[PDB]
Amino acid sequence: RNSIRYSELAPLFDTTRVYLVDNKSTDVASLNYQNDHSNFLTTVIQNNDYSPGEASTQTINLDDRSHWGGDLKTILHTNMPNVNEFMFTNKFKARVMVSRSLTKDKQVELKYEWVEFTLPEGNYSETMTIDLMNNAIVEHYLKVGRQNGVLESDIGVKFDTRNFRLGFDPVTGLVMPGVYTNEAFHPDIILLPGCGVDFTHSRLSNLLGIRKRQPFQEGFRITYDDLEGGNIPALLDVDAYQASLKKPVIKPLTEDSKKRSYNLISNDSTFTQYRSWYLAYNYGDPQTGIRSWTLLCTPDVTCGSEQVYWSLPDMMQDPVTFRSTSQISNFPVVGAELLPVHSKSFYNDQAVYSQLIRQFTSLTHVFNRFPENQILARPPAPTITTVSENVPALTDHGTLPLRNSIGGVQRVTITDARRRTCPYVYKALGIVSPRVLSSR
Amino acid sequence: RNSIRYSELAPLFDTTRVYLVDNKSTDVASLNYQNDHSNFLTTVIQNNDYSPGEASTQTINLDDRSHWGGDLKTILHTNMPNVNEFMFTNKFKARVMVSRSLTKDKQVELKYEWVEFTLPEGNYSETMTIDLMNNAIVEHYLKVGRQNGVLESDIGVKFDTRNFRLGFDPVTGLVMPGVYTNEAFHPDIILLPGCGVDFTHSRLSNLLGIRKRQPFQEGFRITYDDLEGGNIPALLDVDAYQASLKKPVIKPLTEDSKKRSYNLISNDSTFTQYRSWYLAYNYGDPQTGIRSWTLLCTPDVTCGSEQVYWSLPDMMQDPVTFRSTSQISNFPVVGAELLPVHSKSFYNDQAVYSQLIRQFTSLTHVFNRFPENQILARPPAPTITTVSENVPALTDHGTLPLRNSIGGVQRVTITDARRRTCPYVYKALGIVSPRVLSSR
Amino acid sequence: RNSIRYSELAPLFDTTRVYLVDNKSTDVASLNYQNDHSNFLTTVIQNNDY
Amino acid sequence: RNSIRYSELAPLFDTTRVYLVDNKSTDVASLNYQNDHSNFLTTVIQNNDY
Amino acid sequence: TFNPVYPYDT
Amino acid sequence: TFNPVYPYDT
Amino acid sequence: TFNPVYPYDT
Helix, strand or coil: CCCCCCCCCCCEEEEEEEEEECCCCCHCCCCCCEEECCCEECCCCCCCCCCCCCHHHHHECCCEEEEEEEEEEEEEEECCCCCCCCCCCEEEEEEEEEEEEEEECCEEEEEEEEEEECCCEEECCHHHHHHHHHHHHHHHHHHHHHHHHCCCCCCCCCCEECCCCCCCCCCCCCEECCCCCCCCEEEEEECCCCCCEEEEEEEEHHHHHEECCCCCCCCCCEEECCCCCCCEEECHHHHHHHHCCCCCCEEEECHHHHHCCEEEECCCCCCCEEEEEHHHHHHHCCCCCCCEEEEEEECCCCCCCCCCEEECCEEEEECCCCCCCCCCCCCCEEEEEEEEEEEEEEECCCCCCCHHHHHCCCCCCCCCCCCCCCCCCCCCCCCCCCCEEEEEEEEEEEEEECCCCEEEEEEECCECCCCCCCCCCCEEEEEEEEEEEEEC | CCCCEEEECCCECCCCCCCEEEHHHHHHCCCCCCCCCEEEEEEEECCCCCCCHHHHHHHECCCCCEEEEEEEEEEEEEECCCCCCCCCCCCCEEEEEEEEEEECCHHHEEEEEEEEEECEEECCCHHHHHHHHHHHHHHHHHHHHHHHHHCCCCCCCCCEEEECCCCCEEEEEEEEECCCCCCCEEEEECCCCCEECCCCCCCCHHHHHHCCCCCCHHHHHECCCCCCCCCCEECCCCCHHHHCCCCCCEEEECCCHHHCCCCCCCCCCCCCCCCHHHHHHHHHHCCCCCCEEECCCCCCCCCCEEEEEECEEEEEEEECCCCCCCCCCCCCCCEEEEEEEEEEEECCCCCHHHHHHHHHCCCCCCCCCCCCCCCCCCCCCCCCCCEEEEEEEEEEEEEEECCEEECCCEEEEEECCCCCECCCEEEEEEEEEEEEEEEC | CCCECCCCCCCCECCCCCCCCCCCCHHHCCCCCCCCCCCCCCCCCCCCCC | CCCCCCCCCCCCCCCCCCCCCCCHHHHHHCCCCEEECCCCCCCCCCCCCC | CCCCCCCCCC | CCCCCCCCCC | CCCCCCCCCC
């Protein structure tokens, strides 16, 4: 009526457990080899005698007269890096200045080009991720920039995280303090005329916390031109003003120590040519600015909760509309689950008291190369850093229909959103508990 | 129809609870003794009269006319060390230099050999675990190295955690800062010509966060030869260059205070003979380098979520294909569960501001013995340390079939992946609640 | 009595799973576009042809 | 009474057609090779997957 | 005329 | 007669 | 000619 028979052993009734597990010493040796914990074979047999493979011949038979089903809970555990190549978090296109030249007697010829910089897999934490990006902009300048004109003064594109506009005085037209108040509010990207960044093929966008208000329109390009209204205002010549006590004030600090120009639009304007995203969003025209088509969001280092799909092709019936095949990247799905990664949050009031000390701690100002320029400076570390953290996930799918004849060797397969094994799985295993559902 | 009888007590119906518990004062005295919380006996009787053992005679009878089953939830609690012998996290083979000699008139005879260093069980935290490893490399040099030639200058194998390549200038061919930027990115292992490490029999690999892209091929050996492309570049002679203001620059600092050689390949090259894994992974040939067969992963101190299997040989029916036996290491399994250990993550911006202070805090530079050599230095402590932490696990297995005659003494057994009691269990106990499933 | 039929595929019984998901490469292209993850369309079909 | 079943596809009734043909791109590659149009193998399956 | 792009002073 | 509204001294 | 392998100075 509801048996469960196996080769030659006492028949069992009503229910039991078949175990899908990678570890088994025997099968690892033989079976999987060129496989990994995301696409492997395993014997469900569990009987000490019998050579695996020869096991493959045997079968667990759930009484034929009834349609069976089984509860499938699984234990999935990864250890995927915040920033890696497979997830698309190690690359990102941006347009920078390539050459600054003296041409055809009087012309200033500026040549800009798009280029894709890559990051060294792993390096978690958001802030640091920013830094690694800024550094990659530089590392490039080091291989092309300088040796083709282009000064530091005109480095296009830099990810910062502050509100260049806190000091700002509605009359002066300047950041009175003479310094862009060094506190971190949200990541944003700053651009110089003519350049900009593109994330079309990268989840890092999600790390900065900047998304399109219309996601499905593939094409994340944020040009200098887009950051309308909201160019970082200029600094008051704190020195002049004070010593001068008319009043100098109108004097908007044009350079800095080591004399770098703050590219001011004209000898008059209080504004600089440096455009900030964060500004355009909440300080620019809400109806036509950038706030119109992009959204200011919480960072999230994981870069985006993605899901993984399970499949047990040789043991569960194929769900409603999937068709059975043998193409690993199209197997039927039997369970979906978010990919095991969380955002742990910490507190480091030590940030920026630490950037200050961190710089001495790290024997180099590698990230802060321009410790004077109020722009190109090293963005403030925000209190509350986030870090992707891997965690085992004791998930639980529902009862799923089973085949009344379970093969000795079952194939287990965890796929990702785009349907492809996921290299970062360290442990995957599931427990199935069959039971009756109705009869034929 | 569905009774539940016991010796001479009123019959009970429909369900109840039998308790599997180690603590009981009586049985501990008699029964278990030479056993432990992972393989013990216990009386299910729970009746104050009756000498245990004499209890063993009695039996709980679930009505014969029906096939019963019972819900089995358990409470498991361990306290296993991050690094211990049983889990294979206290040893690890590496190949180091044994002797440096002056031979047969003009020959420089270098003799290398493999050797297995061990760690002192317990010592959690990842960073510190690294240190303990580096220290073991040293401790060995202290017993063989020096007293056979081999200088410190040529110590093969050292686990570090930084990106020897941040300063790097695409033209100079040197790390301009004159210092390998002291910030921690990911663990990696550095090697000198001729040596290397092997983890074939160790989970520490998983601690460093370096795995094979093809796990089942038993054999984790990472030779110097493998770390192709990606030898730690050399340092700019910061002193020369500056004082000299042609420009010295090409000058790649050959030694350091206390004069140790940075083994530069030749009087010309800007590269040193020191090869870094982390470099090869993201800075070397992606198609043939190491990134081809190894994967950069998140650390994880636990060294690898492993599972444990339960078994109640004398109380549950043997699941589908297991056969009943009396060999403790083959009992049938009735429930699987991950071994109770998590990765708690913390923030210590105090790292490297602390290594700096930690060294004065610890009255010795035991781990930093070579505070000058930019390589052999003490790796930076990474912000965000991880620590294996034991936690009670209130798990829940499903309803499992029961025998209609439950013995007075049941045997409980928690096994591990390889099937062997697990010494680190402090508390294990379960509650079973039988109930009808169908009739005969 | 309790079937679950689809176009022309073996009938399934008692239960199964239909998946509502935004990600699908095909539908994103066509269907949603001017929509967002809070108001979107998705095919429940899951059959590679069609 | 008179079905015609296949793996997992809707059952068909009364009749249909199985095709024996050499040309198929897949099988020629694998199967026949050392054979010729007078002694060959061919899959009757005709299902694109598999 | 070579920019090391690094503030050696401090 | 302009208040910068900022304590420049300290 | 004995290396204590320890920077006693600092």
